Amino acid sequence: SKDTVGGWKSKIGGMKEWSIENDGLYVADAESHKELAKYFESDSPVCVKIINQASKK
Amino acid sequence: AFEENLYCDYTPGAAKAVAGKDVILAVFNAAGDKLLAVAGQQGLTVNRSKDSIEITSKDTVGGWKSKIGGMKEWSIENDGLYVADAESHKELAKYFESDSPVCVKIINQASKKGLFGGLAIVADYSFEAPFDEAMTYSVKLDGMGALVDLTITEGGDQMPG
Amino acid sequence: AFEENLYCDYTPGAAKAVAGKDVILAVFNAAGDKLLAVAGQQGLTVNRSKDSIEITSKDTVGGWKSKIGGMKEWSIENDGLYVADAESHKELAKYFESDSPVCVKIINQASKKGLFGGLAIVADYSFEAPFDEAMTYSVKLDGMGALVDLTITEGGDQMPG
Amino acid sequence: AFEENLYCDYTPGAAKAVAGKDVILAVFNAAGDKLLAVAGQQGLTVNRSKDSIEITSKDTVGGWKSKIGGMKEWSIENDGLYVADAESHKELAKYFESDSPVCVKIINQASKKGLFGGLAIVADYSFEAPFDEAMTYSVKLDGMGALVDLTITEGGDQMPG
């Protein structure tokens, strides 16, 4: 605004959003891909997670 | 160093270059009592830009349009290796989760001098996990206000401890 | 260089090529008494552009649209190695903070001639610090107006020192 | 800044432009001893209009209508970010509620020179609050009688504070 001084604009934080992208080899008979296809067809939300399989965290 | 430095000179007048590994980004914790170096940084970019306002009019002569300075802003992008157990990364996650404007500063480790410092918000915090190499992180912070330049300002030389 | 120079022509007719080592950007300090070159210059580009105004109408014939000249603008981009303790970089930082216009010029340090000069604003002042190589800097200057051409106008041969 | 100002000119003769951020609308508090700038202004326009009375008659020649000047009026519209606890906004709220004239003045804080002054009424005082941006206010003040143009008279150079 016209009240700010110092020559630098003022900003504040806003909303938040997130997304996950994953690419790899496709196995149509895999149960994971079958579940993903069922979720895509039925448009139901999917509970998803990212884990560290080595550090067990 | 001798033979009157006929072939090789040792006089320190400047460095003529600063190694990128000697310039790092440091953050202040929730209370700010400690300075934390971000774990496993590999790259750092500091952007500062100023808007230009065109004031050309029919009174302008010489065939060249007229411009003046305007508002200015800044942002910092830092990428590198990510370890979830690092204290600096935990503080960054805490800052991201709960708004919490953060105080960061760009410093020179070897020269023992601070370069820049200011308040910013964690605009972007992303990770990538390719299967052929290690997991990497990227972070982008936008400036809420003035980015104090410590090179031409006396003071600002605290280091991580 | 003899026997009528049947294979070795040494007659200087024209340079026919100007190496980038000799084209130097320089700026005037706050007082303007001493002009100094920017430390660690590595690359320089100068952009000068004009506008085209369309004046095509139903009167025009031949199937080709009609255009005329317009306004003018210019900018300078310079990238290189950043030395925070250099006087030129300190002056640039002071100009950027204090938003005062800066007098800049492009000269030929080898041919002992000047090329360009004028007033500008520091629209951008950014730095990059990769961990592999030395930390760098990039500066963009936008013209306030006329960028005089010293290659067609006499004078303008002052140089740093 | 030197070389006889061959290319970069620094002679102060005028401004040729005035930044909008340097123009401030301010109001006198209920007591009047303090001049307060309205908090968080972002836009401001001044309207001044004069009516025209047509006096065309059968003895008018030349095939052109004849008019004369008429009455005058003015209005000021301001807009910006709204904070309830701000002193200026509190004063505006009391002025709107009490239904009393407000002493307003428009100044150029860059040159420390007043531009306009007058007595107004708070005709409109509205607020907006979208869920993506910050809450904003817009005020419109109609003119009570004359509006003194401070640019063509002495005095009226009291900055807020």
**Cβ contact (<8 Å) for B43 and C125?**
no
Q: How many whole angstroms from its chain centre is CA C57?
A: 39
Please report the resolution in angstroms.
Answer: 2.9
- 3-class secondary-structure state, position B66: coil
Torsion of CA D48, D135, D23, A13, to 10 degrees: -150
Place of tokens 């200011």: B118
Pick among C35, C100, C103, C158 to test the D interface (most D CBs inside 10 A): C103
Place of tokens 């294979």: C7
Left if phi > 0, otherwise alpha if psi is -120 to 50, otherwise beta: which for B37? beta
**Residues in contact with B92: Cβ distance below 8 Å, sequence separation at least 6, in sequence order:** B27, B38, B102, B122, B125, B139
**C98 with C84: CB under 8 angstroms?**
no
d(CA D9, CA D3): 10
DSSP state at residue D132: S
Angstrom CA distances, A23 to A20, B80, B129, B138, C120, stand at 10, 22, 11, 19, 48
Measured CA to CA in angstroms, residue C132 lies from B42, B79, B111, D19, D28 at distances of 8, 13, 18, 44, 61
Report the gap between the CA of B12 and the closest CA in chain C (Å): 13
* SS3 category, D152: helix
Beta-carbon separation of B55 and D17 below 8 A: yes
Query: Can you tell me the distance from the alpha carbon of B68 to that of C72, in angstroms, rounded to the nearest whole number?
Result: 15
Q: C96 at the B interface (CB within 8 A)? A: yes
What is the spatial distance between Cα D37 and Cα D158, in angstroms, rounded to a whole number? 12
Give C75's DSSP letter: E
Map residue B53 onto helix, strand or coil: strand
A8–B145 C-beta distance less than 8 A? yes
**B120 phi and psi, to 5 degrees?**
-155, 165
Angle value at C-alpha D38, between D32 and D43, nearest 5 degrees: 140
| Element spanning D89, H or E | helix D87-98
Residue A19 C-alpha, separation from nearest chain D C-alpha, in angstroms? 20
**Cα dist from C118 to C40, C146, D2, D102, whole Å:** 22, 7, 11, 49
Give the residue from B59, B68, B71, B144 with the most D CB atoms within 10 Å of its CB, the best one to mutate: B68
**What one-character DSSP code corresponds to residue B20?**
G
- A39 to A30, A42, A43, D15, D64: CA distances (angstroms): 14, 5, 6, 65, 78
Identify whether the C-beta of residue D31 lies closer than 8 Å to the C-beta of residue D17: no
CB B74 within 8 A of CB C125: no
3-class SS letters over D7-62: CCCCCCCCCCCCCHHHEEEEEECCCCCCEEECCCEEEEEEEEEEEEEECCCCCCCC
Tell whether D16 is within 8 A of chain B (Cβ). yes
D1 contact B CB<8A: no
Question: Could you identify the residue written with the tokens 């806003």?
Answer: A14
CB < 8 Å to D9, chain C: 119
List the one residue out of C61, C39, C47 whose CA is nearest residue C123: C47
Whether the CB-CB separation of D111 and D45 falls below 8 Å is answered with no
Residue type, C3: E
* Residue that the structure tokens 């760009």 belong to: B106
Q: What is the DSSP letter of C23?
A: E
Of B48, B65, B113, the CB nearest to C124: B48
Q: Decide: C117 and C156 in contact? Cβ < 8 Å.
A: yes
Per the listing, tokens 């605290």 go with B158
Residue from the list C29, C103, C150 with its beta carbon closest to the beta carbon of D8: C103
Q: Which residue has the tokens 């934390």?
A: B36
Tell me the residue ranges of DSSP E strands in chain C.
23-28, 35-37, 41-54, 67-81, 102-108, 113-128, 136-143, 148-149
Interatomic CA distance for residues B26 and B106, integer angstroms: 6
- Strand, coil or helix: B44: strand
* Contact list, C101 vs chain B (CB under 8 Å): 69
Please report residues of A whose CB lies closer than 8 A to that of D40. Answer: 1-3
Q: Could you tell me which of B123, B114, B121, B122 has the C-alpha nearest to residue B145?
A: B121
Distance CA C135, CA B19 (A): 6
Contact criterion met (CB < 8 Å) for B69 and C99: yes
CA distance to partner chain C, nearest, from residue B33 (Å): 27
Contact: D1, C31; criterion CB under 8 Å: yes
Separation CA B35–CA A9 (nearest Å): 26
SS3 category, A31: helix
Longest dimension (CA), chain D: 69
Q: Is C61 exposed, middle or buried (0-12, 13-18, 19+ CB in 10 A)?
A: exposed
String of DSSP letters for B105-146: EEEETTTTEEEEEEEEEEEEEEEE--TTS--EEEEEEEEEEE
- Closest residue by Cα to residue B66 from C27, C147, C2, A9: C147
The CA distances from residue C88 to C27, C85, D73, D114, in Å, are 8, 9, 56, 40
Q: What angle do CA C119, D13, C25 make, to 5 degrees?
A: 10
Does residue D131 come out as left (phi exceeding 0), alpha (psi in the -120 to 50 range) or beta?
alpha
DSSP, res B38:
P
Cβ(C96)–Cβ(C45) under 8 Å? no
- Per the rule left: phi > 0, alpha: psi between -120 and 50, beta: everything else, B151 is alpha
Q: CB neighbours of D10 closer than 8 A, spacing ≥ 6? A: D1
Q: Report the alpha-carbon distance of residue A53 to residue B135 in Å, rounded.
A: 13
**B8 close to C120: Cβ distance less than 8 angstroms:** no
Chain C: partners with 3+ C-beta pairs within 8 Å? B, D
Buried b (16+ CB within 10 A) or exposed e, A37-49: eeeeeeeeeeeee
Residues contacting A43, CB < 8 A, separation 6+: none
**3-state SS assignment for residue B22:** helix
Whether residue D1 and residue C103 make contact (CB cut-off 8 A), yes or no, is yes
Structure tokens at D2: 């030197």
Helix (H) or strand (E) holding D98: helix D87-98
Cα distance between residue C3 and residue C14, in whole Å: 23
Q: Which of B95, B92, B66 lies closest to B78 in space, CA to CA?
A: B92
Show the DSSP H helices in A4-57 as ranges.
31-42
Q: Where are the alpha helices (H) located in chain C, listed in sequence order?
A: 87-98
Classified as helix, coil or strand, B96 is helix
Q: Which candidate, D121, D137, D113, places its Cα nearest to that of D39? A: D137
Q: What gap in Å lies between CA B161 and CA B34, rounded to an integer?
A: 7
Q: How far apart are CA B25 and CA B117, in angstroms?
A: 10
Instruction: For residue B73, give how far its alpha carbon lies from the nearest alpha carbon of chain D (Å).
Output: 16
Question: Which element (helix H / strand E) includes B94?
Answer: helix B87-97
Of A2, A14, A15, the CB nearest to D24: A2
**Partners for B (CB, 8 Å, 3+ pairs)?**
A, C, D
| Chain centroid offset of residue D127 CA | 20
D19 interfacial to chain C (CB closer than 8 Å): no
Q: How many CB atoms lie within 10 A of CB C141?
A: 26
- Helix or strand holding residue D96 (H, E): helix D87-98
Query: Bridge partners of B143?
Result: B120
Contact D7 C32 (CB under 8 A): no
